[PDB]
Amino acid sequence: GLPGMQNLKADPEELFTKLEKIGKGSFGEVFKGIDNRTQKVVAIKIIDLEEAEDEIEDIQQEITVLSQCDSPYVTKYYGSYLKDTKLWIIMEYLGGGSALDLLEPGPLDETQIATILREILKGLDYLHSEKKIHRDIKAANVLLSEHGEVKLADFGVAGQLTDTQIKRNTFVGTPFWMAPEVIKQSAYDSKADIWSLGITAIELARGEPPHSELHPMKVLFLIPKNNPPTLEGNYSKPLKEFVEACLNKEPSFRPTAKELLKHKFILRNAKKTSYLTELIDRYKRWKAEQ
């Protein structure tokens, strides 16, 4: 029931060569490796199935959604293989790290912020046209290639607004970045992603989302209660207005990803993506210490 899945005869230990461990979340581990067949780098995510339970349903969800997307803005999925009780998930490798990782060394300038936002808006636009909802937009889920290309990853809880289900009600996402109607489990759609993008715009500018120091439960009542967050500090007027456009409590009043692509903040500051390699190296130097 998992697209891309290979019978047990496909031995992943022989088909792929792990090069190094690049992540160890809570589902398992991630390696940079090589498809020995086509000799190309891939990210290899291994989850122990005999050691995970409820997380399986989310992993299968993610793979299903990734299998249906074909966009240079969404991480590609290459297939899955099974080894004993280990599911190996083969994915597009993005070696530049996440936008959250690129924040570790210091602040981004507005050009970088605009460039990264423009690319995220491209991915959102594709998804929304395909009637898909990301549902977990935030800087840790925006990944970069080593040359600066920007992609959406980790849908996990991505929604599908199809024919007989025009709206979603599921309380899903990470609190700080969740739209108010998602918390209130109201019927919602792509606009929940636009709100999340506004919270991620504050995150790329200040490093953390609003209320990041409060306990999550308090945040559950603050978002629907309080006025929408605003970007405070010395940022240009268009950056603060981009944030306000996204953060409207009324979802149907937030603009589409396509219209935000014409926003003055984006038009005046975004530059080619290759300019992001600088930000990418800063991160490498930084992590080299540590």
- Experimental technique for the deposited model: X-ray
What are the structural domains, with CATH classification, of the chain?
A: 1-93 (3.30.200.20), 94-290 (1.10.510.10)
17 beta partners: 34
Torsion of CA 185, 189, 195, 199, to 10 degrees: 80
Which one-letter amino acid corresponds to residue 95? Answer: G
Residues catalogued as catalytic: 136
No. of helices (H) and no. of strands (E), the chain? 11, 11
Which regions of the chain does DSSP assign to beta strands (E)? Answer: 5-6, 16-23, 28-35, 40-48, 77-83, 86-91, 97-98, 132-133, 142-144, 150-152, 159-160
Q: Which residues are annotated as a binding site for ATP?
A: 45
Contact 135, 219 (CB under 8 A): no
Enumerate residues 6+ apart whose C-beta is below 8 A from 154: 62, 136, 140, 141
What residues form DSSP beta bridges with 151? 143
In the 8-state DSSP scheme, what is residue 10?
S
Distance between CA atoms of 1 and 71, rounded to whole angstroms? 23
Contacts of 287 (CB under 8 A, 6+ apart): 104
| Residues in CB range of 171: below 8 A, 6 or more apart | 182, 183, 185
d(CA 265, CA 240): 9
Neighbours of 14 (CB within 10 A): 9
Q: Residue 168 forms beta bridges with which residues?
A: 188
Tell me if 134 sits within 8 A of 158, measured CB to CB: yes
d(CA 197, CA 139): 9
Judge contact between 119 and 188, C-beta under 8 A.
Answer: no
**Are the beta carbons of 30 and 45 closer than 8 angstroms?**
yes
Distances (CA, A) of 113 to 27, 148, 185: 30, 13, 31
Q: How many CB atoms lie within 10 A of CB 213?
A: 5
